Symmetry: C3
Subunit: 525 residues, 3 copies
């Protein structure tokens, strides 16, 4: 009985349902919790012997790395896989296309299903190559930043991967953001180009995209050229002569293969700005990609035969890591949903899952609460038997929402993964592994590989030893996918994460841990 961790009292462990293992296509990646603890202990005690092999296994390198791990938190010089060279678009597209070009890669569900379509890895390579050829002709090169202002669809994925192909860093801006937000982000990154579309369609409603871009770009001198996709082909949308060019017109000029550009492990893969003044969280290439592939493989128990549906927007780190990189690195299909959970009806999510026999579903608790209110009747209409792993992202999931998730969507036949992580962490920090870790509803459970979790007493600034404790959550050493800096403001990076608790990474979240070692997220501090 915990006097501090009141959540832990009288909550029974929920073993993984049998139907999960029935539906699992192959042997599990981890046999039992003990094997997990052995691997975890190695990842903490021996990051070299643990991550080196996995990095070589899960990633295709243009040049081998000579040092797995370097740098410390206090000095803000963390680096992983030093000396290595690779290209993200190759690991997400090229190698899979060569293996089997006809395998589905992007299952695109549009706002209206009539406009839905599917791209194979061969298709994705050709589109990415063409956009990258357009960008290369425009002078985009390694070390540049390219802005993306697109909804959740194929063009957002293709834009990101083409920018990566050339070695540039993409900065994805949520399509709903105001013109002033676009202005601040583009000017901070000094983007040389922008990829967007004339208009968007969401929930049946047309949305202004190119209009807001124009209103922003009048104050963004760095943007030399804009690439506009005709999502709606509305003739009234205006293109500025000498700056705005059409996606289809330009991609028609260039061939379906373009050599990728090799980049160093620690060369920046992308900037992601977080909502005060916006700050650009910078993520390297090698460390971030490994974190995405590693978490996607083990936390969700993804197998080659599987199909993932991450109901998140690329404007959010969730979309980046688990809608694009994690899945495509592992070569599995990923579902890209442009619409709203309600349009045309609140059965939209389930309609898509049944349509594509999705094996994994990843959603935020906010949508779960909305669907609890309005779409309970619609859940029963659709066939969700293909699913076996259900994920929760972005906020604490209350046990009642946990039980609702388990009953109506999972049918108490699926594993539930409550994933705790930040934009800065790149990938999962604390999460219960699918098919390995029994669940405590509302608990993120054990930390993942490379994550040495700790609880600090805020007043003393001292780590709290032992279980049955509550405090601010910190990490004792840097992990592969940890953000390396804040764009052109490394002092802010240090002051925000490294300096507040020296020797630690400060999450900004308070949490508690019970006698079983499960971590309970108490929310922001």
């Amino acid at each position: 009985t915990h006097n501090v961790v009141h959540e832990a009292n009288g909550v029974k462990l929920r073993e993984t349902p049998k139907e999960f293992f029935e539906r699992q296509p192959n042997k599990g990646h981890i046999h039992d919790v003990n094997q997990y603890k052995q691997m975890y202990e190695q990842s903490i005690k021996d990051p070299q012997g643990f991550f080196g092999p996995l990095a070589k296994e899960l990633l295709s390198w243009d040049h081998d790395f000579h040092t797995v791990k370097s740098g410390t938190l206090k000095n803000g010089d963390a680096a992983w896989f030093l000396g290595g060279e690779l290209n993200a678009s190759y690991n997400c597209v090229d190698r899979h296309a060569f293996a089997n070009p006809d395998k589905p890669a992007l299952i695109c569900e549009a706002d209206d299903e009539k406009d839905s379509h599917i791209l194979t890895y061969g298709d994705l390579l050709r589109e990415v190559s063409k956009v990258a050829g357009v960008l290369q002709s425009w002078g985009i090169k390694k070390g540049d930043t390219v802005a993306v202002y697109l909804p959740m669809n194929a063009q957002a994925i293709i834009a990101m991967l083409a920018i990566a192909r050339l070695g540039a860093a993409h900065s994805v801006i949520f399509a709903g953001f105001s013109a002033g937000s676009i202005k601040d982000r583009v000017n901070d990154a000094s983007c040389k180009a922008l990829i967007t579309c004339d208009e968007g369609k969401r929930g049946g409603r047309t949305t202004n995209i190119k209009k807001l871009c124009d209103e922003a770009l009048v104050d963004c001198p760095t943007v030399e050229k804009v690439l506009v996709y005709k999502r709606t082909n509305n003739p009234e949308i205006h293109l500025t002569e000498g700056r705005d060019y059409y996606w289809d017109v330009e991609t028609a000029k260039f061939p379906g293969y373009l050599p990728p550009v090799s980049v160093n492990s620690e060369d920046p893969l992308f900037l992601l700005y977080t909502s005060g003044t916006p700050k650009g969280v910078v993520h390297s290439t090698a460390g971030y990609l490994l974190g995405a592939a590693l978490s996607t493989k083990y936390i969700f128990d993804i197998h080659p035969e599987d199909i993932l549906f991450t109901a998140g927007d690329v404007g959010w780190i969730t979309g980046h890591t688990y809608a694009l990189y994690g899945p495509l690195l592992l070569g599995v299909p990923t579902i890209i949903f442009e619409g709203t959970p309600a349009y045309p009806d609140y059965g939209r999510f389930w309609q898509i899952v049944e349509k594509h026999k999705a094996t994994h579903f990843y959603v935020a608790p906010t949508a779960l609460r909305l669907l609890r209110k309005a779409g309970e009747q619609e859940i029963a209409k659709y066939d969700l038997s293909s699913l076996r792993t259900l994920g929760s992202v972005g906020e604490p999931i209350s046990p009642d929402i946990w039980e609702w998730y388990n009953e109506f969507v999972g049918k108490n036949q699926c594993h539930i993964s409550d994933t705790y992580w930040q934009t800065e962490s790149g990938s999962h920090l604390i999460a219960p592994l699918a098919g390995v870790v029994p669940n405590k509803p509302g608990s993120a459970s054990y930390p993942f590989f490379g994550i040495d979790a700790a609880l600090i007493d805020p007043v003393t600034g001292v780590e709290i030893e032992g279980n049955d404790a509550e405090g601010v959550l910190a990490i004792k050493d840097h992990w592969p996918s940890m953000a390396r800096t804040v764009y052109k403001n490394h002092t802010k990076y240090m002051d925000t994460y490294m300096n507040p608790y020296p020797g630690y990474y400060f999450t900004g979240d308070g949490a508690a841990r019970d006698h079983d070692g499960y971590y309970w997220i108490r929310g922001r501090v």
Copy 2:
């Protein structure tokens, strides 16, 4: 008895003469036609296991490749040796210089023999490095295009290899092209620099080079700097201050070694502009690794090139023949190549044979047009010279008539040499159909069997369906892409698809009609798409018509092609005036070039 292939009836196979194998420096690369077909079948069914090893054997890689072959014709995304890195100038120059820097590389015969000279691989390395150092100081870098407007001499080769050394793509413009032609090509490629010379010498007459470049460059804003070689050192030739600089003066500033720049297999090696059925010339883009492998492979096997051999390709670098078989093929194989600046007639019609005797050339590559001209005027001169060093004779650019084939064999070859009628296009990069020297017996006038990686096929033009069985005629196509296939048309990939890939989906469209006989030999009957080959030059009737219409006095114009005794085919122009023939001949001479003028 062929009911369709009338050419094949009553044609006896011509085995390679015994004297060929006597003169051959070593055992042949292929034993017999049977081994050739076994290797060919492997190249078709299993291109990875066939070309992968050859690529490692014949090319020196900075980074190893992970995939031999990728992409399809239907999608226009063909790629070979993916992930590999290499440099063309290293494979053509550096490695051979290290082996033996004193080995001859460029045997340069100038328009007048007094100006002739020879460069060793060490010499070529130093000159290439110096020019590349000049270009690198000017800001030329990987991904740029550099224009070349030079005659056929050492400086053209050096300019091309220097551009390649830096990872840039060279665009060679035939020295005869008009100022307007230079303008269009430079502006299409947006070249940052141009390499040319003050004046040229051809057939004993001085020609204006820097003059035409200046006239073009007034409308070429992308050209930041020009490198001018003192071919004649005429002081009256004017250099634009701040743009024009002298070859000798600038190269003197930089050292004789410059590190080569690594490039990906599919990074573009060069642009070559070809007149098409459009009215505007199109820049054919060729990759690096695939093109180089095709050049070395075809040069080695079809011509039976050995290290001891010397090749004489009587073609201009402005033509794909010069690129592949005057420069890259030979230098990749490390053999000397003869670079002839003059004409077959100057000073006398024994000029070619004089050169062959002078350097004991083992291989000779020429277009049938020159053979017909020398047959007309220079037949007597062959006997004065010693041509015994030759064993392989090549034909390029046009169908070779059996009568010219026999003339070639009898008077030049002395019925002691192999004859290789090579069929290929600028777009193919290297040979498509040709009889391998010492391997394939010849049917005069037939290119014979297709080469490695080339899965030739005849399509019924009317139905668009592949024709099974022999003794058939149809439009010639290729069923899968090959290493040296052109990858795009510069910044216009849609024209590339519409021209080659889309007309017969799943196939490569040659634009040629051809036949296949019972023995499998292919007979090229010429273009189907109204393109005319005059004296070895591909010309578009559309471009000539547009040039005719430019003249305000002409209201309508229509141009066609017909048989010509000397140039193979001639172009005849018909004009309608609203209310002068020499003026129109000069108008097209000014619009395209002296070569494209109508007969």
Copy 3:
């Protein structure tokens, strides 16, 4: 044996290495005896490929392997070494040592005033270099650019050089005392895109004008886009031109403590070093990357007998080739600490050098004879106050060392317990040409002794232009074939390079120095050929 020509040699007894040298050396010597030395020397001359290939792979960390050890000839000025290889100098000087042991001292910085002294570890140096390189990379500096340095001898000069190298650019270091016109001429020749400097310098207790001379030059240097200024004195009266000048601390705060290095080809230029020139125009000596670095590490290891445990103190300025090779590259490639002295030998007193040596137990000391003569005049009394037992190798650079100065050096500084290395070399040679190896070659005072690996020395008669065979000879000193660290060109003027070194005596490298060789083969440098 009376030498008819080599009058210096008569009556000079070989001076064997003192016993205390071997007592103090932490490990077995790199070379057993002179006989082994001559075997290796002969191999380096006859078989440079089989000799330098292995050493190059041992001492340097390569991003891409090389396919040819040696290429080109002197007569054609196309020398190239380790062709096809790729590497980064800042990685070999900083990164690899930092990963091995980040807390090992790298830069032992002794400032003009000792209170301002500090020590940077290899980990510290990695972070500082990475941050400066991040500043420069954000400014657009990239491979193929040149960056000028106008700094005194302190950490910031080393860091600036290594950061420029990290990005693949070539650094051109300018002596801090040089006039504005000198800065102008050098910057414009190189067309430098950026400049790194400080507000003011402090030398011998007095403040010195640095930023002022830079500004006066930069009004005529249109290529310089941006300036990085370090607050050495933080004098508020110092003016920065807005839109060009930015502060070292302010900018480096923006960027992270690790930056990936940029790989460059062996023969890509590592640095330009301009030489003080008689007549009008200064000439920029260009040094490759692989060849120069190997020469630095090789000479530093063998001539001075540097071991990982050792500490080196090179009393030379980075504006001089001595600072480049043996204050920065040589020691840092070998991963040993190097002492960086900002002040003068006299301030606060003439015991400053010896104070530093005792403070950090420096094992190797490298100085020019000029300082030795000055200290002989004024600072003999201070030597006795300090403990120099840590020393075992004493070096002389830049001038002929008089036998009297040699004995003074050995007795008062070395206590007749150290080896003395009279190193002969030029900016163009990159590293030592003729020098007696510590603990291997017995010394004749005033003689540079035997040539070093890869140096095939020869004497030419100026009148006949013919090599002089046999010993007891005098002539102009030349080298018969190019060596790894030989200068490759003079920036954008290769004809001047040829006319100066290659063309006067074709097939030879012309040192511009006259020298003699005695019966034992020891070389005696007699000085420049003009003025003989």
